[PDB]
Each structure stands twice: as structure tokens, then as C-alpha cells.
RNA sequence: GAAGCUGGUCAAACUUGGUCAUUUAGAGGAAGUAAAAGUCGUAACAAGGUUUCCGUAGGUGAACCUGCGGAAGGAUCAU
RNA sequence: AGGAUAGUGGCCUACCAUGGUUUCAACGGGUAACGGGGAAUAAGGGUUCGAUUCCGGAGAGGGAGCCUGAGAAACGGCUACCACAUCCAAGGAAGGCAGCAGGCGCGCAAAUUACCCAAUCCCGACACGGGGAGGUAGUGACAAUAAAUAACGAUACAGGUUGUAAUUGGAAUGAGUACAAUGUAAAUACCUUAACGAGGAACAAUUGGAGGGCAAGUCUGGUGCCAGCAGCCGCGGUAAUUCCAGCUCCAAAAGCGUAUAUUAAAGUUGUUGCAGUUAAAAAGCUCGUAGUUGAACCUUGGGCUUGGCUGGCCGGUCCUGGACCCAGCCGAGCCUUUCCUUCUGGCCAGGACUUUUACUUUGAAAAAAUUAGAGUGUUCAAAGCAGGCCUUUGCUCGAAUAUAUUAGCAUGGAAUAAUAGAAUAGGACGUUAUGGUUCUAUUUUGUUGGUUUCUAGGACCAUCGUAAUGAUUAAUAGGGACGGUCGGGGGUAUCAGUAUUCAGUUGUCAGAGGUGAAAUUCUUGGAUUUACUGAAGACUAACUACUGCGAAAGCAUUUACCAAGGACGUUUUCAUUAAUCAAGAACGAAAGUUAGGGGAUCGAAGAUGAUCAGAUACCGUCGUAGUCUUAACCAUAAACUAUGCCGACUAGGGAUCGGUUGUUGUUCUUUUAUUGACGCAAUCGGCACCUUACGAGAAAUCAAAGUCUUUGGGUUCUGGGGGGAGUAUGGUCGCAAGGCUGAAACUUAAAGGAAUUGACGGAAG
RNA sequence: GGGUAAACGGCGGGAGUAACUAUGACUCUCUUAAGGUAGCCAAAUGCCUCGUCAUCUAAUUAGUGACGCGCAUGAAUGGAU
């Protein structure tokens, strides 16, 4: 627990045992799919798309309604990000703390956090190369990383 | 991290049996656990155990009877040849007349007495007495 | 659990670990370093012939108060001078200066014995005759 | 068709140098251990008569003292 | 590509590329290193040894080069040099025992310059010769086997039908001595054997001891801390259970001590199987690589038929054998939606295909010797593989079988652990799907050889038709996203606050300061004290806690910003992305180092006044570095929870922090809600605390220090009696101070941990 | 009257004393503003002096390494490297 910390918290989501769409749910399989795509074009990440689905539109699980995962729908509609969402956000946070460091050199805590973040990037990046999501020559460089998160 | 569900199962069984409890919850369940209990159940060492489905790894509720002395795993799963069994029985089991060596074999999970009958050998998997 | 590797592919880590920790054992360390072959006066031998240089009486360690009568012997095999005990009531008289004495250990295997300070060897034969046979006067010294 | 001869080849051996390893000498210096407890003091063990100990830096015949920051293995589990 | 070789090959040459090995330990060094079969010790796992009766290799003083020859880089073949070395008539000539015996040296350490080809086998022109190969003898307490120094009576006292203790006998026999025969190539020896061969049957048994360990004296005499003994503890200072003597007794016995090394003992090297809070020992802390280890999940169940061996029932009994019967334990063969390659000749033989394994059964192998072990009366035995038969003009059990164990081969199986497939479909089937693209060819029409279309096999390409067309859960493992939070988490500016010191003013007036007491010191040139004004640097009191945050070190005035973070909430998202980790990185209290800036206060050094025998110490007064900060180093602390990190379970209880979920005779917002605080139930996570001991521990104690002789969740590090010593040396990092790595000689029987009693305290009651 | 030594400069004598001797950690003693500290030395600084020991050579008043009561070494009159 807490790969890069000492915490042991367990706060998380608990999907229901029921894998079938609720009785009160009136939307069809496809209507969700284009509804997903409509928010996809607004730049909303799959985490954001799922969040806005349940909050305002009543989609508890997109897999129990559409049959396929939110990101899997995006890939078959050509909307899957080149940089995966979790990797994307790790790199963007890495840039922001880095930028914080050229104005605050004495923030040793910021330097230590930056090492942890880039440590997390490379482990997640090594995964995406064993599974052919990223090119086998993919490398994270701090100098020009802002190009990928631009 | 959680490296062996079989070890976490027999331990919670022993930590319940010494405590005198007549039931114990096992989490998570697996085929290796379920087939392990059956070898224990056909010898009366435990009672009617239930499998809970939670669309997940699974859970097991075991019923305890009080005839179990000590059940434990042998980790790592050493490779045991037919001439390797007599050494494993002597060191692990209190007496030559009772107690079992659970071996996983190409023929299935079995104790050393059923293993010697059909003269097959595999990897040692635990013990019970 | 138990702090040492148990995985099935970890036979190497155990092989190196044990061999490293055998060096803390002095029996193993003395054998491999060959300290007997280098620094031990016999050079790892059981007995040795040497030449007596001078006879010495030594004050004892506490609480015993006595004199242990040993001699200065130079060894013929490697030219070292080390002290050897003469053990028998009145066997100092049997040994003379510049005699060839066959020495042995005290059974402490390189360690000082009893209250005797700085001495580890004892005379077994003088002029080719056992000092026990001379103390019992079974034979007589050749001279 | 012998000795012999030319050029090659393998190359013993020596000289020089370098290197590595193992032994061994040395004025003097600075330690350690043993002995008996010779000289000076009393540092520690009691609140050991200045609580002790750690790291670090100065100082001092010597044990040691002092500063700064720790620890309680404190003489306090407590207002 | 060539040369050379018997031949492959950088083996060598020419040309051309820049490769090859390595933390899975290359390369280098040491080796008191020839390797193996084996030996010692061993409950097991293991440890030490292996020159040496067998196999393979290398060498003949150290190199080098060749002749002959199938076969040699040969040495009881040569040549040359080096080092020794023999004769010499001084010109020259001849050497090689790490073969046999034998001589010197070295050592703690090791045999006769004997005989012979008779046995085994080898060599030759070979029934005939040769063989220090080989065999026999000499020395030989290397080891091992068997095994003598007595036995039985009668008296005799003691004695409970007999065990003897003394003085009284007649037998038996080999140790030895020898005819002779056997034995042998000839002898010695063994065995057989006439005669000789025992009363102290002198035909004489020794080696160590007798305090404990450890078996066997408190017997006598000698010495008198001396001699000496004593592996260790100790014994000896005039009654020594321990030295020096005698007597007695013990242990083993033709054998018994000493020394050294090693094995067991040693669970003190720990895979089985150690320890790490305090006895030695958890890296200061995080990241992280190799390595080690890694959630669950994919044909189960049912039904039928059948083969085999256990118990009986059968009994069928000379323990023993049969269907039916009962079960049991396996093997199968089918149906269940059905894996189990596929065709030809027709369960074998001829074809075409196959995810890789790891693992395990069996087979083959793993030389002989050695080990275990079958049989066999070498008189037994160690042995040896002989042998046994009514006595044989021959008959006849044998001369096994196991263990080997890693690598390689074959084989049955499919749990356990991996590995692969169908996501922009480049997917699987159409066996005879349609075509099209090409390639191969046996067979023709036989009088023989040319023509390219049917045809058959690939190997593909496009189209159409098939299918239930094709993606496991989201782990109370993880990562990320989002929502309100919560923090004395961090950085940069800014805002207080008093206090301290120093100054300027105002007021008096003899002291002030400081101590246990004083003195140094400041004071009528106004000290101390008073009020106000002013400046500097530090530090953020009280609130402040068995409270918070942080990887640790640490973090406490306000506000603004900056970028982070944990926990909770989540019917969001990705799906194993993880745990611990050699090597390598970031941070790392104080002190210390370098350069600027600041330097109020404290204050190492130093100076000082006391105290004292002396104190250059503690006490007092000053005080320099420093304390603060900006740039960089250092990388250590009792960096401590003296307790590695991750995971699971185990016993009750109440408080408290952050979140979140349902709720009040409560006050307030505001007069009420959708305020806030408080109060009551919950759960998450924490920091902890109380009791108990199921259990653990040497105990103190411990909710982990439990789930550990009923010994196994993963993994990293560390320790092996105390010193010497974290020293020396080498390396490496640092400006230095120093850090990291890190011995040995030598020395010692103890060092130490927890607790008990007492004693003591310039401690409390 | 106070301050100031990277101002000029300065930086002491005598006795006894440790189960041989030798030496003197130590003590006593007079005295200074302070009594030479860290270092270094027969040094380009030491008279005695060609000091003593070692090394270098057959032989060395030379050289180097040590020793140190040093006529008369010594810390920005800079000390040691």
C-alpha cells in the first residue's frame, strides 16, 4: 500500500455484485456510446467521462450498459489518447513540480518529490512497453516533456 | 505483499484451531485451496466448508471439528521424487501411522499414501495431521 | 520469514552467503589462510627437531607461585627460536645446552597452557631418547 | 651425391629494462600486550559527591574537562 | 581467398569489418591443486580428505629442435644451450634412478644393492628366448581377522544345596623346539606330524590413572608455594583424597598413552537447522537496477459398461486355488455440446503437421574395484568366489541383485509455475467453395524425340459462404482521475511580539552585581534602579497535550503566493502495472570546512576571582571562533521503538486525530432552517494507552518480541568468546577534519545479559 | 584612566623525586607583562663541533635520515609543508 509512501488507506470504490443494467435505467446500449463520444470530443478524459456519466446521466457502469469499457469504446472510435491518462497526468505533474524548482532551488522537499514522481513515471512507462502501448524506444526526458503534455 | 493464498489459508486455520473456534473464514479462495480442503475433508479433519461467490477471487467458510493437530504448507514447493517421499514424511510427520503429506502431481492433489498407491510424484504442497 | 531466501531459484544466494560467513569461524579461517604454514613455528607440523640455546626459569602466573623450567630452542627446519617446556620432576638435568630436542604441543593447539606464560611446547626426546624413558631411567642418555 | 653456402622458420641461453609476488635488514618513531601492582591523581560504579553515555570541535601531566546537538541504557512513566 | 595439416578450424598468411568475454563473477592472484572411481566421519542433511593397487593426463634437471617409425616432439633416442656433474695422457670423451635394489641431504616422517620366470600377461622370426613387468622371500606393532598367559578336584577355614579364600594333586595343551611329509621354480613359512617341551605351570602383561569431569583410596612415608602435577577447574605455604614413594584398586589388553590435523560432539556455520529489544549482530532514511518472489480465474460433475488385486463370504483348507456377493484401491472404454494430431497401405508402417518449457513415472546408460547385499561352514573370522554330489574315467547351483545421479536420450501425465494466440483483425474453416496467379511432372500416342491445354500436388492471391465470429474479474495488490477537507509538511516575501544588549534624554543618590559564602567587575566622572524615545540581530513564550504533519533528519508569530501530500468519499478510470532488493542515487540533527553578509544573546579557546594539597575543573566575571543567513562541502549521532520492509490471522476495553455515514431536554446563526459548536451510535485509517496471558521469552517483558523441535509467507542486511581494533595496510570518496571498505601477529578464561539475597549510598519515605 | 600585538616588540630560573641505575610524569621553590604554544632543527640559524647514531664509500670535516635543556629555532619581525 502506497507504493511511494507509508500509508495504508483503503478508500476505494465497491462495484455492485449485479452486472446487469438496473431496471430504472432507460437508456439503450448505443445511446451511451455516442454520449461517451460527445464528451470525448470535449477533451474530457475517460475518468472524467465516467464521472460525468453517473453524476448527471445515470450510467452506473458503462461496461454493464454498453458491454465495453469506456476507453475501449474510445479506441474503436479513434479517440484513445496516445499518452494513457494515468501516464499523461504523471508527466504533467512532473513538469509542474519541475517548473516549481527553477524558482525554488532550496526546496529540497520539492526535489525529493520530483524524484518520486519520475520514479513513478519510469515504472509505469516500462509497463506500457512490455504491452506494446508505447513504442519500445519510448523514453521520458525532463527537458522536452512539456511537448507531450502541451 | 500477498504471495501465497495457500499459506494464508492453513495459518488462519491453525490460528483458529488452537483458539478452539469451530469455524474460520478463508480469503481469498482458489482451486488449489478448494482441492486442498477436499483432501482434508475426506479424512474428517474438517467439516462442511462453503464457497462464497463475490464475482471475485472468492471466500471460504470452513467448519472445524477439533481433530486437526497441525496443518501447514511446505514452501517452496520442493520437487519430490518417489524416493524423496520417505524423507519428507519422517521430518514432517509425528508418527508412521497417521498424518499426511499433500503432494500436487500431474494426477492431481493427493496425500502421500494415495500417491504411493498410484506410484506418481510431483511437488510437495503441504502436510496435515 | 526467517530472514534468509527461500525461493526455489535462490540456491546461489545461499551458496555465497554461507561461504562468506565461514570466515568468522576461526577453525576455517586458520585452515584457509594457512597461518600454520606461515606463522606457526612448526610450520603446521606435529613435532619438530631443534637446537637448545639457553635454559630459563620462569616465574609463574597468579595465583600459583613456582618456577616452570623451560629452554630456548632454535628450530632446524626454519631457524626460529621458541621456548619449550621440560615436563618431569628433575628432567631439567637430563637436557643440556646445545642438545637436539624433539618438541610437541601442549594439546591446547597453539595456546599457552595453565599458569605457564609464553610457552607452548614440551620436550619429547633428547639425543634420540625419550625424556619419559630417562625420567623412569628405562634407558640412559647417549653421551 | 658428402662437407660447405644463401635465405627463412622454431628458437635454447645471456644482457638490459619493466613488472608482479614472497621473504628479509634498518638509526629512530609510535603503539599494543604481559608482569607486579613502582609514581601522580580519583575518571567510572550510590544523585560516585559536577547524573552518565553518543556524535562533533577545542583544550589539558594523566585519568579527563568544556562548548553545541542528541539519548535515557536516569535520579522522573505521575500534577 | 589461399598456405600448412592426416584432416576441420586464425592453425598461419593477405585483404576487410569491429567484433568477442563479464556482477548468472569475466580477467587477475593464491593454492601447504594432477582430476575422477573412491576414503574418513556420519540418524538424516552434510564436513574433511583423495601422492598413492583402477581410469584419464602430464613429466623424466630446465627449456628447444628433430631422425626412424603406422604410431614419439620419445629421453633406460639424438642434437644445442643453461645448472650441476665423471674420466682425462689436458688433445679430447662420456652424463641423466620422477624404473629395481641401494648411497647422501631434508626432515616429525618411511624396507634387502635377496631369488626366479614356476603362476598373470606382454614382446620377438616364436610350442623353444627375454621380461627388477610380474611373482616369492628379507625388514615391517601402516591398518585389519582369528586368538594363548590357564582349568578341575581334595583339604581348609568363613560362608550362604555350593563362590571362593590358602596347600595339595593328577591331567590337557600350544608358545617354542625337530624328525619327515607336504608345501615351492628352489627354499622360508602355514597345516599335518614321530620325540622333546609347564607349578612361581620365572613359558612372570602391559599401557595410564585413582578430587571432579571419569572408573578407581580421604591408606602409609617423603617435600613443605618448593619441587612439581594439572587438556579445564585448581592441588602444593608441615594431617597433599591432586606432587614425590609403597600398598590397594580401576579402564583397555597384545595392546595402551603423547603430539598434530580433521570428523562427530557443533542446532558453535544452521538447506533440513542458529541468532539479531536488552547478551555479538536491523544499513540514518527513502528511491532504485540486476536477482529472489509474485491475487484469483479456462471440463467440473453425472450416467453406463469393462479389465486388474486386497478382505472374506464363498471354502472349493494343502497357507493353498473359481464365477457369483459385499465394499475398497487402481486401470480402462463409451454418452454426456467434447479435447485425445491427420491420411494411405488395411494395432504397424509409410507419409504430411506440431507454442516453448520447467516438473515428475519408467526404460537405456552411469566400467572394474570400493559400498549394501544373495548364496557358499575359507575349522570361525577377516576373507575368497569358490563349491556340492557314495567317492564318481563325471554330474552338477553359481559366480546375483540393488545404490550411482548432476548433464544428455526415450517415454506416460497436464495439477503446480511460466510461455503463445483473434483488436486498425494481416484471425479460423469451405474437407470437394468459386475463380485467378504462378511453380512441379509420374503417365500418354510406345518404334522412339518435339508441341501446351485439360490434369494431380503445392505456394499464394481476390470473392463469396460459414460461426453464439474474436477482448476473463477489478484483488479489502496497485496507479491515476475527481470532491470536500486536514495538517506546527516545504519554498519565497511580508506582519507581530515582548525580551536582551546598547544609546539618548529625563529623576534621585551609595552602593550595585554575584555566590553556599565571597572576590574579580561596574560605581559621587552618578553605578544599580525608574519612565519615555530609538537601533540592531536573533527566538517565536503562555495556548502546548501520552496532540498533528513529514522517508528520516525535522517542523510552532500573521498573511499572500508557489508547487506538493496523506487519509476519507467514489456504482470514475487502467488492468498486475507489484514486494524486497546487490551496483547506483536523493535527503541527512549538531559540530566542523570554504567565500560574502550579518554578529543582540549565549559562548569552545583564552584571560580571569574564588575553592583546593593541587586544580589552567565544577562556581563567578569577561570573552575569540561559533551560534543567524546566502552560496557550496562534509555524510556522521544513544540518527533508538537499541525492535528491517511487505502480507495474513489471533483478546478484550475505553479514550483521541482527520474523513465519512445516521442521530439530541443543547446554545448559538437569527428568529429557524440548508450555520457552527456540543452530545449519542457507527465504520475507515492513524498516534497511542489499560488489563489478560491462549502463546512466547533467560528474564525484564511482549498484541508482537505470538502463529518458532507440532521447526517452511517473500525478501534485504548483519553476528560467531573478550581484547588487540574499527587499529595497521591497500583502495576509494573528501579542501581538510574525516567517511566507506578493513586484517594479522599477539594476548586472554572468561567478558556479558536478566533477576535474587545481602552489603553499601555525600537518595526518598 | 580605558583600548590596541596581521603596532614596535617580548615569550624565566633552582632543587629533590618512580619496588637497580638512568630519566623525571610529580612535588617544592624564587620570579615575569607573559614565561616559547603548534611546529621545526647541528637547518643559509649550534659556539662547543669534524655533536652522537644510522646510511652513502675501501676510505667521507661533504650529503641524507634521525636525536635534541636549541651559545642564539618558532609562528603575516610569518611557522610547517
From Swiss-Prot, chain A:
A Gene Ontology molecular-function term?
A: structural constituent of ribosome
User: Where does this protein chiefly localize?
Assistant: cytoplasm
Compartment(s): Cytoplasm
Q: Does the keyword Lipid metabolism apply?
A: no
GO terms of biological process kind? translation
Q: State the family it belongs to.
A: Belongs to the universal ribosomal protein uS15 family.
One GO CC term, this protein = cytosolic small ribosomal subunit
Q: Record keywords: Heme included?
A: no
| Highest taxon of source | Eukaryota
What keywords sit in the KW lines? Answer: Cytoplasm, Ribonucleoprotein, Ribosomal protein
Q: How does it assemble?
A: Component of the small ribosomal subunit. Mature ribosomes consist of a small (40S) and a large (60S) subunit. The 40S subunit contains about 32 different proteins and 1 molecule of RNA (18S). The 60S subunit contains 45 different proteins and 3 molecules of RNA (25S, 5.8S and 5S).
Protein name as annotated: Small ribosomal subunit protein uS15
Q: What is its biological role?
A: Component of the ribosome, a large ribonucleoprotein complex responsible for the synthesis of proteins in the cell. The small ribosomal subunit (SSU) binds messenger RNAs (mRNAs) and translates the encoded message by selecting cognate aminoacyl-transfer RNA (tRNA) molecules. The large subunit (LSU) contains the ribosomal catalytic site termed the peptidyl transferase center (PTC), which catalyzes the formation of peptide bonds, thereby polymerizing the amino acids delivered by tRNAs into a polypeptide chain.
**NCBIfam families attached here?**
PRK08561.1 (NF006331)
Q: Where are the transmembrane segments?
A: none
Swiss-Prot record, chain B:
Q: Which domain of life is it from?
A: Eukaryota
**What pairs make up the disulfide bonds?**
none
Q: Where in the cell is it found?
A: Cytoplasm
What's an example Gene Ontology biological process for this entry? translation
Which GO CC terms are listed, alphabetically? cytosolic small ribosomal subunit
The record's section on InterPro entries has:
Ribosomal_uS8, Ribosomal_uS8_CS, Ribosomal_uS8_sf
Q: What does this protein do?
A: Component of the ribosome, a large ribonucleoprotein complex responsible for the synthesis of proteins in the cell. The small ribosomal subunit (SSU) binds messenger RNAs (mRNAs) and translates the encoded message by selecting cognate aminoacyl-transfer RNA (tRNA) molecules. The large subunit (LSU) contains the ribosomal catalytic site termed the peptidyl transferase center (PTC), which catalyzes the formation of peptide bonds, thereby polymerizing the amino acids delivered by tRNAs into a polypeptide chain.
Family that this chain belongs to: Belongs to the universal ribosomal protein uS8 family.
- Protein name in UniProt: Small ribosomal subunit protein uS8A
From Swiss-Prot, chain C:
Q: Where in the cell is it found?
A: Cytoplasm
**One MF term from GO for this chain?**
structural constituent of ribosome
- This chain is encoded by the gene named RPS23A
- List the GO biological process terms: translation
> Keyword set for this entry?
Cytoplasm, Ribonucleoprotein, Ribosomal protein
Any single Gene Ontology cellular-component annotation: ribosome
* Protein task: Component of the ribosome, a large ribonucleoprotein complex responsible for the synthesis of proteins in the cell. The small ribosomal subunit (SSU) binds messenger RNAs (mRNAs) and translates the encoded message by selecting cognate aminoacyl-transfer RNA (tRNA) molecules. The large subunit (LSU) contains the ribosomal catalytic site termed the peptidyl transferase center (PTC), which catalyzes the formation of peptide bonds, thereby polymerizing the amino acids delivered by tRNAs into a polypeptide chain.
UniProt main location, coarse: cytoplasm
Entry-linked CDD domains = Ribosomal_S23 (cd03367)
Protein name per its UniProtKB record: Small ribosomal subunit protein uS12
Q: Does the keyword Cytoplasm apply?
A: yes
Amino acid at each position: 500500500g502506497r507504493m511511494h509512501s507509508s500509508g495504508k488507506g483503503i478508500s476505494s470504490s465497491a462495484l455492485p455484485y449485479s452486472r446487469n443494467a438496473p431496471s430504472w435505467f432507460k437508456l439503450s446500449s448505443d445511446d451511451v456510446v455516442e454520449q461517451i463520444i460527445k464528451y470525448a470530443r470535449k477533451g474530457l478524459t475517460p475518468s472524467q467521462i465516467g464521472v460525468i456519466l453517473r453524476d448527471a446521466h445515470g450510467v452506473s457502469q458503462a461496461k454493464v450498459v454498453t458491454g465495453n469499457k469506456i476507453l475501449r469504446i474510445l479506441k474503436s472510435n479513434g479517440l484513445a489518447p496516445e499518452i494513457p491518462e494515468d501516464l499523461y497526468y504523471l508527466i504533467k505533474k512532473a513538469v509542474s513540480v519541475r517548473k516549481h524548482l527553477e524558482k525554488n532551488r532550496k526546496d529540497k522537499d520539492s526535489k525529493f518529490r520530483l524524484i518520486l514522481i519520475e520514479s513513478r513515471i519510469h515504472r509505469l512507462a516500462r509497463y506500457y512497453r512490455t504491452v506494446a502501448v508505447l513504442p519500445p524506444n519510448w523514453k521520458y526526458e525532463s527537458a522536452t516533456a512539456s511537448a507531450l503534455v502541451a | 505483499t500477498r504471495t501465497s493464498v495457500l499459506a494464508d489459508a492453513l495459518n488462519a486455520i491453525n490460528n483458529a484451531e488452537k483458539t478452539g473456534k469451530r469455524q474460520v473464514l478463508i480469503r481469498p479462495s482458489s482451486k488449489v485451496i478448494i482441492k486442498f480442503l477436499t483432501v482434508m475433508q475426506k479424512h474428517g479433519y474438517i467439516g462442511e466448508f462453503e464457497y462464497i461467490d463475490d464475482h471475485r477471487s472468492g471466500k471460504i467458510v470452513v467448519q472445524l471439528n477439533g481433530r486437526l493437530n497441525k496443518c501447514g504448507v511446505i514452501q517452496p514447493r520442493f520437487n519430490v521424487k518417489i524416493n524423496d517421499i520417505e524423507r519428507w514424511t519422517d521430518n514432517l510427520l509425528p508418527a508412521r501411522q497417521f498424518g499426511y503429506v499433500i503432494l500436487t502431481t500431474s494426477a492431481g492433489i493427493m496425500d502421500h499414501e494415495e500417491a504411493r498407491r498410484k506410484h506418481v510424484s510431483g511437488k510437495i504442497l503441504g502436510f496435515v495431521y | 520469514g526467517k530472514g534468509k531466501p527461500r525461493g526455489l531459484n535462490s540456491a546461489r544466494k545461499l551458496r555465497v552467503h554461507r561461504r562468506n560467513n565461514r570466515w568468522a569461524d576461526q577453525a576455517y579461517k586458520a585452515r584457509l589462510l594457512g597461518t600454520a604454514f606461515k606463522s606457526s613455528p612448526f610450520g603446521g607440523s606435529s613435532h619438530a627437531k631443534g637446537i637448545v640455546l639457553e635454559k630459563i626459569g620462569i616465574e609463574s602466573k597468579q595465583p600459583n607461585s613456582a618456577i616452570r623450567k623451560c629452554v630456548r630452542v632454535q628450530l632446524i627446519k626454519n631457524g626460529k627460536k621458541v621456548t619449550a617446556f621440560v615436563p618431569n620432576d628433575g628432567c631439567l638435568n637430563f637436557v643440556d645446552e646445545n642438545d637436539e630436542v624433539l618438541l610437541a604441543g601442549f594439546g591446547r593447539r597453539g595456546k599457552a597452557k595453565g599458569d605457564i606464560p609464553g610457552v607452548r611446547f614440551k620436550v619429547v626426546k633428547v639425543s634420540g631418547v625419550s625424556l619419559l624413558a630417562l625420567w623412569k631411567e628405562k634407558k640412559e642418555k647417549p653421551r
